[PDB]
């Protein structure tokens, strides 16, 4: 019956603005206030504010006046919260909830929308040149978020290729390596260019790998 529905996980850049929905159903909607609550990873619950869907009247917690903007659509039976000037401090699961009003109790909660506010970064791509069958590769480094896909010689080369799983570093950036074993004779002829796709930053980086002088 009573169901509150929020959007899925949002990745968003510092200094922009996310508008989070909340689709109310199985009850009057226009009769109950909708409260909003912020929760950081493994931390506790922070009340943002509530909006009465009837008049669109809003009460905000001080800490969020000028950060959050609570909106609604009576026609679409849906609440909204717009967070601005996004900083890392705003990385959190955000919850809409129905207010019982008599005891001001959040009685039914939304699944919650996990919002992450960081900058998406394409990888630096350094080559792994061989010096003697030999192995060569490129090291994708400092990328956010997952995933990156790596082809070799524009996908022409596929055997010997070990594109490894990604590794999170302290920096909070990912880094994988793609390596390929090849005949040590073809080093003098065949050119080896690894291609690095990263749909998140619309990036495609090619890098020739050539033995050290």
């Amino acid at each position: 019956e009573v169901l509150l529905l929020q959007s899925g996980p949002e990745l968003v850049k510092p200094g922009t603005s996310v508008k989070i929905p909340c689709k109310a159903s199985g009850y009057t909607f226009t009769d109950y206030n909708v409260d909003w609550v912020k929760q950081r990873h493994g931390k506790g619950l922070e009340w943002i504010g509530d909006i009465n869907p009837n008049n669109g009247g809003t009460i905000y917690s001080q800490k969020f006046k000028g950060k959050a903007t609570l909106t609604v659509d009576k026609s679409s039976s849906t609440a909204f919260m717009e967070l601005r000037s996004l900083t890392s401090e705003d990385t959190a699961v955000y919850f809409c909830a129905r207010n019982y009003r008599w005891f001001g109790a959040m009685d039914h909660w939304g699944q919650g929308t996990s919002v992450t506010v960081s900058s998406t970064k394409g990888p630096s791509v350094f080559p792994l040149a061989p010096s003697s069958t030999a192995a060569l590769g490129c090291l994708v480094k400092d990328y956010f978020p997952e995933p990156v896909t790596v082809s070799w010689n524009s996908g022409a080369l596929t055997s010997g290729v070990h594109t490894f799983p990604a590794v999170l570093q302290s920096s909070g950036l990912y880094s994988l390596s793609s390596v390929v074993t090849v005949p040590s004779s073809s080093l003098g002829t065949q050119t080896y260019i690894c291609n690095v796709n990263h749909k998140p930053s619309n990036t495609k980086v090619d890098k020739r790998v050539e033995p050290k002088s």
Binding site: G44, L45, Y100, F103, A105, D107, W109
Partner: protein
Amino acid sequence: DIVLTQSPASLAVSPGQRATISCKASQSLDYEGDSDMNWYQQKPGQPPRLLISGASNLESGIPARFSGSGSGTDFTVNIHPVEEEDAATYYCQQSTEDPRTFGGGTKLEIKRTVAAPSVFIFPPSDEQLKSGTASVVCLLNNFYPREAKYQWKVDNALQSGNSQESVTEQDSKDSTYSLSSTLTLSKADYEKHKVYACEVTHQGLSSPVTKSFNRG
């Protein structure tokens, strides 16, 4: 800015135990005859669920095991009994004054169920001695977890290779096991010693328990 201070911060409890959490409030929550105190269970990776609205009123579909409480500055949610499904962070919250504030949360850890073995020793029956063979039996009953080091010790002498053992399939309900070790000897090797015993070790026990009988 009403500060609600939950106490304790973290408790570990066994299912079957009664547990109680407490919200102290910086000022009274009493207004127009009720107190606007509400409690939320949040299970890991799930949104919070309201249990108690108004420091007493149970929410629909919340078990009676959960109870409300009091007024002024002193509030208490009680779980009687606790069940394994109760592992969650419990949050207290006021709506007396804007801003609506939450307590710091209380982490409730369900303790691993530990069942000590009921240890029982059994001497060979007369009907068996007459038949020429002696069989002493040590029962470890309803123990959890499976790991359990027992040992036959006849007149303070560790026996070896003269005992086999069977183990029950873990019980559907309480997950408990039972073990039966059968030390077998000759009627001769039986009328030779006095105190036939059985030392049992298990997490559940403080100190190892030794069931023994005389007239061997």
